[PDB]
A paper describes a structure:
Ryanodine receptors (RyRs) are large ion channels located in the sarcoplasmic reticulum membrane, which control the calcium release from the intracellular store. They play a central role not only in excitation-contraction (EC) coupling of cardiac and skeletal muscles, but also in learning and memory. Insect RyRs have drawn a lot of attention since the market introduction of diamide insecticides used to control a broad range of destructive agricultural pests. Here we present the atomic-resolution crystal structures of wild-type and phospho-mimetic RyR Repeat34 from DBM (P. xylostella), a destructive pest devouring cruciferous crops globally.
We also solved the crystal structure of S2946D, a phospho-mimetic mutant of DBM Repeat34 which mimics a permanent homogenous phosphorylation state, at 1.53 Å resolution. The mutation is located in the middle of the flexible phosphorylation loop and does not change the structure of the domain significantly. The overall root mean square deviation (RMSD) between the wild-type (WT) and mutant structures is 0.17 Å for 192 Cα atoms (residues 2838–2930 and 2952–3050 for both WT and mutant). The first group contains seven sites clustered in the phosphorylation loop, including one in helix α0′ (S2959), four in the flexible region (S2930, S2936, S2946, S2948), and two in the structured loop region (T2973, T2976). Two sites in the phosphorylation loop (S2946 and S2948) are conserved in RyR2 Repeat34. By docking the domain into the cryo-EM model of full-length RyR2, we found that Repeat34 is located at the top turret region of RyR cytoplasmic region, and Ser2946 and most other phosphorylation sites are in a region protruding away from the main body of the channel, which is structurally less conserved in Repeat34.
Numbering used by the authors: 2838 to 2930, 2952 to 3050
Write the structure that this text describes.
């Protein structure tokens, strides 16, 4: 069938340096996410609405609650722990009016643009492994949720390789951008 089994991260604990890079990427990625949502005509609203394209997380990072910040930090932290777990080493060595009208918070996100940075084929492969792991983490949690509530189904409870590209996009994009951001910030990833 499908038995999601995330990477075993036993013993792996992030030190202050790697917690800091998780924090800095999370803030960067929030601004990249907000920039994309605003480009796609989303606006801030107190309650999330898919139909009305209103999103409560469309605020400056420092106005987010801890739940909101963890939407970024949790999967990023887990992807970094998974990389370490499988033996990789991590060496730290004008304002447009319609853009501004998307929120009442004078928020014009301008994250660093890493579209001109490239990833080796090896790092592209690693981003796919980390995205698959994010999917397995989600799937294991979802199966637990369904089972304790007496059963049920979910259309994305299939192996990562059976998801469509569109289904894979959120996790793939996060890991690709994280690996670019590590590169940008002067980290070197070394294979086992
Ligand atoms: Cl430390
Ligand atoms: Cl923070």
């Amino acid at each position: 069938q499908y038995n999601p089994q995330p990477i075993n991260t036993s013993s792996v604990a992030l030190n202050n340096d790697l917690n800091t890079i998780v924090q800095k990427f999370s803030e960067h990625y929030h601004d990249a996410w907000a920039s994309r949502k605003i480009e796609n005509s989303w606006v801030y609203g107190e309650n999330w609405s898919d139909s009305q394209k209103a999103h409560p997380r469309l605020k400056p990072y420092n106005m987010l609650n801890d739940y909101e910040k963890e939407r970024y930090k949790e999967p990023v932290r887990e992807s970094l722990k998974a990389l370490l777990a499988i033996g990789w080493s991590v060496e730290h060595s004008p304002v447009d009016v319609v853009t501004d009208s998307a929120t009442p918070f004078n928020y014009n996100p301008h994250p660093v643009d890493m579209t001109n940075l490239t990833l080796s084929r090896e790092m592209q492969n690693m981003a796919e492994r980390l995205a698959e792991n994010a999917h397995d983490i989600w799937a294991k949690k979802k199966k637990e949720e369904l089972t304790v509530n007496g059963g049920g189904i979910h259309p994305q409870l299939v192996p990562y390789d059976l998801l469509t590209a569109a289904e894979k996009a959120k996790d793939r994009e996060r890991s690709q951008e994280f690996l670019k951001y590590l590169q940008y910030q002067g980290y070197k990833l070394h294979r086992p």
